[PDB]
């Protein structure tokens, strides 16, 4: 049984992908992936869209 309870197996790879996009705030990257569950598209759109400063 492949364990999906190993989030970085999805997250960290998408994190390299965001890493390619100039997103190296691992925290932000995978937090975006936390609320998207591996939806890196929305992950990016959360980094671009949800920047509450």
UniProtKB/Swiss-Prot annotation:
The lineage of its organism: Eukaryota, Metazoa, Chordata, Craniata, Vertebrata. Homooligomer. Binds signal sequences of proteins that are targeted to the endoplasmic reticulum. Interacts (via UBA domain) with GJA1 (not ubiquitinated) and with ubiquitin; both compete for the same binding site. Interacts (via UBA domain) with ubiquitin and with polyubiquitin chains. Interacts (via ubiquitin-like domain) with PSMD2 and PSMD4, regulatory subunits of the 26S proteasome. Interacts with ATXN1/SCA1; interaction with ATXN1 inhibits polyubiquitination of UBQLN4 and interferes with PSMD4 binding. Interacts with HERPUD1. This is Ubiquilin-4. Residues 6-50 form the UBA domain. It is found in: Nucleus; Cytoplasm; Chromosome; Endoplasmic reticulum. It comes from the Eukaryota. Detected in testis, ovary, thyroid, kidney, thymus, heart, liver, lung and spleen (at protein level). Highly expressed in heart, skeletal muscle, kidney, liver and brain. Detected at lower levels in testis, lung and spleen. Ubiquitinated; this does not lead to proteasomal degradation. May undergo both 'Lys-48'- and 'Lys-63'-linked polyubiquitination. Regulator of protein degradation that mediates the proteasomal targeting of misfolded, mislocalized or accumulated proteins. Acts by binding polyubiquitin chains of target proteins via its UBA domain and by interacting with subunits of the proteasome via its ubiquitin-like domain. Key regulator of DNA repair that represses homologous recombination repair: in response to DNA damage, recruited to sites of DNA damage following phosphorylation by ATM and acts by binding and removing ubiquitinated MRE11 from damaged chromatin, leading to MRE11 degradation by the proteasome.
């Amino acid at each position: 049984g492949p364990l999906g309870s190993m989030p970085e197996v999805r997250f960290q790879q998408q994190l390299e992908q965001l890493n390619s996009m100039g997103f190296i705030n691992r925290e932000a990257n995978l937090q975006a992936l936390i609320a998207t569950g591996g939806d890196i598209n929305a992950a990016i759109e959360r980094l671009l869209g949800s920047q509450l400063s």
